[PDB]
Ligand binder design. Structure first.
Ligand SMILES: Nc1ncnc2c1ncn2[C@@H]1O[C@H](COP(=O)(O)OP(=O)(O)O)[C@@H](O)[C@H]1O
Ligand SMILES: Nc1ncnc2c1ncn2[C@@H]1O[C@H](COP(=O)(O)OP(=O)(O)O)[C@@H](O)[C@H]1O
Ligand SMILES: [Mg+2]
Ligand SMILES: [Mg+2]
Ligand SMILES: [Mg+2]
Lengths: 49, 446, 426, 81
């Protein structure tokens, strides 16, 4: 019937509207360890000292 | 814990022997070699005695004779509390420690000391941590209510422990394994009281460990360290950095002398416990004459842990010298030490070992493939079939059937070659690959 | 674009049963090598076992390194392939054995999920004793600087009108620059104008930055906090690689075990590579002989080809492939056969197609004749020179004149040797 | 006098006299500049902190291969885009 054609047309009006590009660039940071291996042995070192 | 998925050497867990120092024909994976296992038990009783020193034994004979299996069985059978040094002698060379320094480090690591320290504790739910100002009359009125499940009690901070709680940012109610001579208060998390708090609905968000022991009790904590840690502590004011990174720096002799005296008097004073372990080394035919003299004097020294030294090669060239002698060792050390010969295997023990390997790898084999593997192994060597079983299992998956059939082992045999196959293939291609001169006749025609 | 003798190979071509096609994805013959490589590929895809190695033996231009690159590109991005040559293990400041274990530790991939957060905002005040009042788009919060990071902040010339990207977990500070809000300060202001960052200052993200075993080794052996001054001293006192011992190895094993048992992380194996083990001395061979007898040594591949030649590092050990007899007895041989006339034809055809050379039929056949007459590599190196010669000699195709000019210009080893026996001087 | 905006750097085009005539044209000019750098230089500048001294003193050896792979993929994707 008559109207639901326009239901698809709400897509046909987003194709001629505007396309775009990407132009992305990668960049990173340093990942982290924070459990540490210092506090577990400093006490033993001071005891033996 | 101890992440190691599988190995050709992860199939033995604890060896197997009896109170009579007699071998077990199926001793938890490793089989046969009655002399080898009886000698292993003899050495085990020797090291449990802890009364002899400066003994060297040579595991001679042809290679592949369960020598590594013997070493692993001994290591897993002696038990805990006795750390070992199982390192091959090839990596003795280094760009940071000389040969003398490396040998001294190994020898001093082979002998350990346990130390008992009468440390203290203050355990209990410290529901509050009050830090009052430094009043002139009383320099610290710092309230803090440590109480276990047994009793309810309060305490007081002596203007030194306030930052000890919060060296890392923690709250009250933390079980504190405090030490008097540490200054670094360790918080164990949260803790419980024995009160219902207020009348309306509440008591939410409370499920943790509650203190169990007494408010205070002495703990004679035992710590096990090697001479490496003590020596690196002596050399530099900070020693953990060099223990972790590994840049000790060839510590000097008077340090070892004063440590010798200190350990002797500590043993005499009943504060330390001597644990004279045993050192394991490999490829002794490859060892060099300066190491020979080093071990020669070490054996005659009053302090020398027992030695597990072995030469896979027989009547091989003695590295570091111009002459070749049996075992790759000159007759001086050869007569100084003792010898245990090791002979090869028959086929049935190879079959049993491979069956143990398979059931360790939880693979539903078919006995036809096992028979093929036994034949292939006995023709060339055990390790051949030890790899053939795995590759045939892979081929079993590749044909979409769990059972390891004949065609799997056949494809494994035909695809990957054999030492005899390789030598025949190369001696017929004397002018096809790179040779002594490197003459490669890539020209197939003309 | 650029092409260097490869990128023509794009996979073995194994079917659902692991059988590769004749010529597909840059391949020619050698069904034995292809099938063995497929078997090893399946074994690695199992991801259950470890501590096994093979060597593939073949002459020059027999596809050994070609098969290595094929298996590498077949494995995929995440699982790493470790290429290394016997010349690489000769290091400078550390011993060769430690270098081998560094390669082994960095070989195994370890997918992990650790946490990072970043404070980023416009500074509002600083209180020396430390306050840094970062003002984001909707948040304005004042952290405390530890004295070291306080000094780092001081060196960052940060003042009212500045935004800094100071990480939370590492702690290092990276100033973003002058605030774009104060764009009305100078029509030709030198400093870049960057606005107030979105979200709260303490922006938190979930990151999938993984870690190789060597990565977390150097994480604590040589801390790399970076931008702070104390991190500069930390990375300056010991900037190099230190000889990590077995004690730190066991500590690292415990740490990785607890991290992988935390649940989110996982383990993936890897493949290492060695070429021309004939040049390797007896010391490294003997040490690796006892090193593969472990539970952590991952999969490595060997590429060597020597006849009855003395093993380097010795004087009397004569064996094929320059490998000591024990290693041969504990290592799996894969066979490779010399290439054939039709294989040479197809190789030159594909190498012309990848190089955008539309070499005609008779030219291709003559190039095959030269490939079969002296050596495959001698014919392969002439594809670009003949095309460029025909371009300079105004020919889209390659006539016999171009290949004859190449054969009289770019000689092979045989012709040079023929010259060398008749010369008044070398 | 010619100065830059983003840096404020001073460049002595020459004294007027006591010997260049007063310039004509418009004050503010725009242009483009292309900077060249070799592969090893990129590897060594960003690998560590003191490598800037290594640009002249050469105080580095066996740069970590992780930085090399990162710069290689950076160059690859830079060329791609
Ligand atoms: N008697 C045995 N029982 C079980 N496994 C063995 C036995 N002998 C050798 N192996 C296997 O062989 C490997 C060690 O080889 P080995 O025979 O010790 O060589 P070598 O005698 O030259 O040291 C181990 O991984 C072990 O799994
Ligand atoms: N199956 C193949 N398909 C396509 N090109 C190959 C094949 N085998 C070898 N080549 C080419 O031959 C050259 C030599 O092969 P490579 O395996 O790298 O070293 P080698 O075979 O000499 O050990 C390579 O540059 C490669 O491009
Ligand atoms: Mg063995
Ligand atoms: Mg003597
Ligand atoms: Mg090759």
């Amino acid at each position: 019937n008559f109207m639901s054609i326009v239901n698809c047309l709400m897509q046909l009006r987003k194709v001629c509207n505007h396309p775009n590009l990407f132009e992305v660039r990668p960049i990173l940071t340093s990942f982290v360890l924070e459990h540490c291996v210092a506090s577990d042995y400093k006490d033993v070192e001071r005891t033996l000292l | 814990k101890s992440l190691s998925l599988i190995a050709a050497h992860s199939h033995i867990t604890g060896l197997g022997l009896d109170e009579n120092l007699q071998p077990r024909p199926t001793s938890e994976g490793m089989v046969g070699q009655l002399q080898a296992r009886r000698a292993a038990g003899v050495i085990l009783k020797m090291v449990q005695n802890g009364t002899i020193a400066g003994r060297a034994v040579l595991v001679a004979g042809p290679p592949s004779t369960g020598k590594t299996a013997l070493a692993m069985g001994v290591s897993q059978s002696l038990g805990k509390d006795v750390p070992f040094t199982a390192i091959a002698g090839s990596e003795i060379f280094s760009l940071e420690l000389s040969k003398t320094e490396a040998l001294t480090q190994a020898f001093r690591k082979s002998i350990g000391i346990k130390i008992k320290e009468e440390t203290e504790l203050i355990e209990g739910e410290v529901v509050e941590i009050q830090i009052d100002r430094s009043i002139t009359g009383g320099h610290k009125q710092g309230k803090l209510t440590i109480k276990t499940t047994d009793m309810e009690t309060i305490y007081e901070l002596g203007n030194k422990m306030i930052d000890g709680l919060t060296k890392e940012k923690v709250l009250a109610g933390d079980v504190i394994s405090i030490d008097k001579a540490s200054g670094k208060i360790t918080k164990l998390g949260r803790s419980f009281a024995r009160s219902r708090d207020y009348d309306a609905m509440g008591a939410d968000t409370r499920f943790v460990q509650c203190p169990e022991g007494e408010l205070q009790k002495r703990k004679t904590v035992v710590h096990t360290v090697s001479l490496h840690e003590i020596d690196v502590i002596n050399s530099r004011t900070q020693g953990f950095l060099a223990l972790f990174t590994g840049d000790t720096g060839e510590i000097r002799s008077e340090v070892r002398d004063q440590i010798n005296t200190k350990v002797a008097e500590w043993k005499e004073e009943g504060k330390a416990e001597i644990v004279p372990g045993v050192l394991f080394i490999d490829e002794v035919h490859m060892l060099d004459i300066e190491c020979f003299s080093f071990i020669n004097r070490a054996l005659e020294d009053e302090f020398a842990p027992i030695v597990m030294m072995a030469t896979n090669r027989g009547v091989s060239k003695t590295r570091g010298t111009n002459y070749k002698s049996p075992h790759g060792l000159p007759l001086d050390l050869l007569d100084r030490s003792i010898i245990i010969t090791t002979k090869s295997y028959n086929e049935q023990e190879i079959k049993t070992i491979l069956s143990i390997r398979a059931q360790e790898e939880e693979v539903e084999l078919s006995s036809d493939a096992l028979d093929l593997l036994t034949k292939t192994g006995v023709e060339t060597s055990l390790r051949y079939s030890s790899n053939l079983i795995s590759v045939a299992q892979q081929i079993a998956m590749k044909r979409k059937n769990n059972t390891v059939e004949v065609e799997d082992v056949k494809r494994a045999y035909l695809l990957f070659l054999d030492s005899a196959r390789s030598v025949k293939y190369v001696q017929e291609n004397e002018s096809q690959y790179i040779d002594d001169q490197g003459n490669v006749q890539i020209s197939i025609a003309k | 674009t650029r092409t260097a003798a490869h990128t023509h190979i794009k996979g073995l071509g194994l079917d659902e049963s692991g059988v590769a096609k004749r010529v597909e994805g840059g391949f020619v013959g050698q069904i034995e090598a292809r099938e063995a490589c497929g078997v090893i590929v399946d074994l690695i895809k199992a991801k259950k076992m470890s501590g096994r190695a093979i060597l593939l033996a073949g002459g020059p231009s027999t596809g050994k390194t070609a098969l290595a690159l094929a298996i590498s590109q077949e494995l995929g991005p995440k699982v790493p392939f470790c290429p290394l040559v016997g010349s690489e293990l000769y290091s400078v400041e550390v011993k060769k054995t430690e270098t081998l274990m560094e390669n082994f530790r960095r070989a195994i991939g370890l997918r992990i999920k650790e946490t990072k957060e970043v404070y980023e905002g416009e500074v509002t005040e600083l209180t020396p004793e430390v306050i840094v009042g970062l003002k984001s788009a909707k948040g304005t919060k004042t952290l405390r600087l530890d004295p070291t990071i306080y000094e780092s902040i001081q060196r960052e010339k940060v003042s009212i009108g500045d935004v800094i990207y100071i990480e939370a977990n590492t702690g290092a500070v990276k100033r973003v620059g002058r605030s774009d809000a104060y764009a009305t300060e100078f029509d030709l202001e030198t400093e870049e104008y960057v606005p107030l960052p979105k979200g709260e200052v303490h922006k938190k993200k979930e990151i999938v930055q993984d870690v190789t075993l060597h990565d977390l080794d150097v994480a604590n052996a040589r801390p790399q906090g970076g931008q702070d001054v104390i991190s500069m001293m930390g990375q300056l006192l010991k900037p190099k690689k230190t000889e990590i011992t077995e004690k730190l190895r066991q500590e690292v094993n415990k740490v990785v075990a607890k991290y992988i048992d935390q649940g989110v992380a996982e383990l993936i194996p890897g493949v290492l590579f060695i070429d021309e083990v004939n040049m390797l001395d007896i010391e490294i061979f003997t040490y690796l002989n006892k090193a593969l007898e472990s539970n952590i040594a991952p999969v490595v591949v060997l590429a060597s080809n020597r006849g009855m030649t003395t093993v380097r590092g010795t004087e009397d050990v004569i064996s094929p492939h320059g490998v000591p007899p024990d290693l041969i007895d504990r290592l799996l041989i894969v066979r490779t056969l010399p290439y054939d006339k039709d294989e040479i034809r197809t190789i030159i055809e594909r190498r012309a197609t990848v190089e955008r050379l539309q070499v005609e039929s008779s030219a291709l056949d003559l190039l095959a004749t030269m490939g079969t007459e002296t050596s495959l590599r001698y014919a392969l190196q002439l594809l670009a020179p003949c095309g460029i010669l025909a371009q300079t000699s105004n020919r889209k195709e390659i006539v016999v004149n171009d290949v004859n000019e190449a054969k009289l210009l770019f000689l092979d080893a045989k012709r040079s040797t023929k010259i060398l026996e008749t010369s008044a001087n070398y």
